[model samples]
Target: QTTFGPVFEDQPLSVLFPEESTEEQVLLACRARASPPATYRWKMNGTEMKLEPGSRHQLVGGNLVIMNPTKAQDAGVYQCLASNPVGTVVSREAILRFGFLQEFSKEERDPVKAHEGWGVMLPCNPPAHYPGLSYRWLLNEFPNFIPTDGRHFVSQTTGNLYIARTNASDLGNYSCLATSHMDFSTKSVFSKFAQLNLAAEDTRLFAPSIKARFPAETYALVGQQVTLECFAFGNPVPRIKWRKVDGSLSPQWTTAEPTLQIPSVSFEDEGTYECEAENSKGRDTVQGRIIVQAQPEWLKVISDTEADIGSNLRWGCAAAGKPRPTVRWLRNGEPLASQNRVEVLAGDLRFSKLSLEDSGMYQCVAENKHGTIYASAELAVQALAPDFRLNPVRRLIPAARGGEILIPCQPRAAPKAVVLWSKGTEILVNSSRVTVTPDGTLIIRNISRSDEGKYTCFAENFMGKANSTGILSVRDATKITLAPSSADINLGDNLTLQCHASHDPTMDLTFTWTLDDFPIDFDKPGGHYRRTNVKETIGDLTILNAQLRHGGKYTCMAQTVVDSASKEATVLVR
Candidate 1:
């Protein structure tokens, strides 16, 4: 047996009237020329359906019959299947669209013309499976009108073309093209093109001009004013309005004339402002920029207080502000005057070579566009004097016995101070025993040979502070006495002589013997005297030698760390 290769065919489906059909009302007859009788089946949208007896759809004489047809639920693919032992063969699928040809409304058949400055709309509704459908719009056989370009036309919410600001050049014949590729169906829809006549009028009712006045370019002092004028020309003398660059309008600025006035301006007013002129036709705008200037509020002082009497002292004052403020100096509430000892170096309020008379209240004033400001300082002067002082003026008995002494004489005067010391109008200090420290401190050490005198200290600080002084005294002994009443000794005989003195216990005493105005030594067995003894007690001196050579005059000296004292004794040796 030979088999057919799935051969299938079907009649062209039609859209039914009344437009209400589902699977039950739309049917097609099926015919199969296979070698054997085939089992028949039906399917919708690729799904099979079961056949029943006495149903609305039935098979009679190898044809499928539908009793009633409705458009509802009828749009889908339909197929009939026939099968045998050799193989199953399916008929070609048919899509059933149930709807009548749409009736043309009056709006569609007779379209309306659109104005140039207005918009146009075209209405259309195609079938669900209407193949190869496209829409296009043209003007006067030229595709010059594009709905997307903002200059020509725009799309409205209802799929209309809106053309704004139309003119006479926009007049033309407009057409719409609707095409279908499935059957090569094409239709041209058109409407009359509008010839719009519009004119742009001169909105200015009056002519306007602007003017401004300001201080210097760079800076502005506080409390300054800036003036601006806007002169506008337009028809009907258009109203003037002021607006800030931030898009805020100043309603109060509106006036009959195109002039704007700002008084007592502040920094917040420094920005761009717009002056607008509006009339019955339209509006025009112009912008002007304003800046406010202000002076600096604070000043700085730079000067030295401790100055030499005759030397130069300089004072300086500086300040900053907008519009470059002017500076001036004043003394004692009056303008500074030039003198022999005083000079005003006027470079930004600086004064130099100041003298004692120049010492007073000094003022610095700065003036700008805003206003004038003043700053003052007090200057004090001092006399020229030498510097002098004493250190460790009081001494203890024992601890100060053999220590060193220092007296300060620091001179601080500008002309180089000199220090001098005197005892009862007699100069006691010489280069040999007295010396001065780097800071002018007088020093005397190892004082044993009657170093008892009044000392003085001095110091000075040039032109600022006056000279200072201090005095000191050195006293080591209060009294002295002889140990024995009388002492007698033969020639070449040994004797002992002693002397005592009362003073600070810290004093170290030394005794000296003189014979015929010459110093004598008692080393050879006390020089044939019994003995010569010297002792110190509470600042005393003692001798242990009594010889013929030591019989003239003997002196006892008591010395402490800071002071010294002496006493004389007469001795007789036979």
Candidate 2:
């Protein structure tokens, strides 16, 4: 024995149908297995699919293709047939469901069956529920699908039918009819015809569609008289029940049943309540969330939220609602501004830097169309321990000998930290050598080799002392101080070059003066210039006699252990 069917490994099936569109490409594959390879052919409804080659519809690689497939003619069940020398097998049917406009009809009564090969009369029974939506009946002559009685049309209201009973025309075949209707979600199942045989041994029939309907998304308040109904039909006489979000019951929901009554519903009664109808043929689980509305209530009550100065604070709140509510935040009986540093996200409010202004009663309001609720939060901001404004620094401070400098420290606290400067165990005092400025800065003048040590700044008041360290080095380099910009003098005025240097306060310094490189201010030498008024680390050149010749340029240089450098300026005499 040999087995032959669809080649599952080669060509897989399609899952989603082509959407409801005018022109969308739809591809279907069908391959088979035999002692040898088999040929495949496809069909739709009951017609053999013989589409045009390469234009919109084509056959490629044992598959059918439809370019720009539409809902009108292309959206339906399609089947593939494979045949070979040994046998033939059919492929799985592909259903393309789509959305369409629906028109319902009045409550449909029971329908009558027809007798094949006999001229008989019949009527149709449409489904109830959907307003302006209905069904109808169709007939195909026996042994042939074409009608013989020439009743080309049927009544839309009564669905009445008549056959002559005499001229036995195209007999032996008759079925049900479909109308211009579609599904609520999508569409499927074009036409259905059941086997209805008569006592005379010739018959055709059609049954009502298996569809159920009940209240969907029905809204109700607490303790209201609510009645939910579930009704429908099924192939095996629908087996239904009363299904809920929590449990279920026995009521052949597949068939049609009684009213589900709800006494006084409370907040706990808010849930998913459903009246379902299910069978082997179809189903309709009509459902709605039982949103029992009531005033908002806080699940977690509000309390006081506290934070210190310059710290971030976040206060949270929670609330409950019937159909879910929204949360709003308020501060000191007024709405909080959605400004910078104040963030209101979700049900929590946040402040980047808390202050006394934010120290008040806060509220979290939960509101909906039904009711509003509130919770309170009292925010408190207080001054905390002493801390550094910027991170504490621990590095070196380099200074030329005899140079005056100001080191720095910035401390922040409520009562202000009293800053103290110390060189190891020695507390620095405010003298001609050192002083503390009002702006929390340390001043040092006339630096010397004796001033070389580690200096620490301490900020202490109430909350503990905080110390920052810095290493000071009195370098031997001679750096020029207050160099001249440009000396302008009258043709008869005196031209004087004044320059100073920072030395080790002990090293003997000399100036190498010139107009240009003369002031690289490093080594010492004698040039076309004379040095005068040689102060401690300063040099001044005074020319009692002024002339254009003395107005060119002048340089001031210093010679020290560290190879000092300085600059000079030109004596511009007009």
Tens-digit lDDT string for candidate 2 (1-574): 3333223233435434424444456677776555567777777885887766578778886787877766566667777766554334455467665444433343343333544434345444443322233334444442223342223224344443434232244333345443434322433222333333343443332222323244456577776856565444333344445667775432432223434666566666567776665655566666666665665667876675556666787677777765688887766435666887789987877788766676655667887777666554456666755676566654768787677888878766654678888888898778877888876688888888898888888888665677788898777666788575577877666556688877666677876676534343222253234557777776777654456666666766777654668676777767
Mark the regions of model 1 whose C-alpha exceeds 4 Å error after superposition.
1-241, 246-264, 278-281, 295-308, 330-404, 410-417, 422-433, 445-453, 457-574
Candidate 2 off by > 4 Å: 1-350, 354-398, 409-419, 424-441, 446-454, 459-565, 569-574
lDDT of 1 by residue, 365-433 (tens): 766665556554555555655432333223322223344667555554555565555444566455756
Best by TM-score: 1
- Looking at model 2, residue 399 earns an lDDT score of 80
- Cα deviation of 126, candidate 2, in Å: 7.2
Report the Cα lDDT for residue 571, model 2: 77
Evaluate residue 326 in candidate 1 and report its C-alpha lDDT on the 0 to 100 scale. Answer: 69
lDDT of each: 0.49, 0.59
* Ten-residue region with minimum lDDT total, candidate 1: 209-218
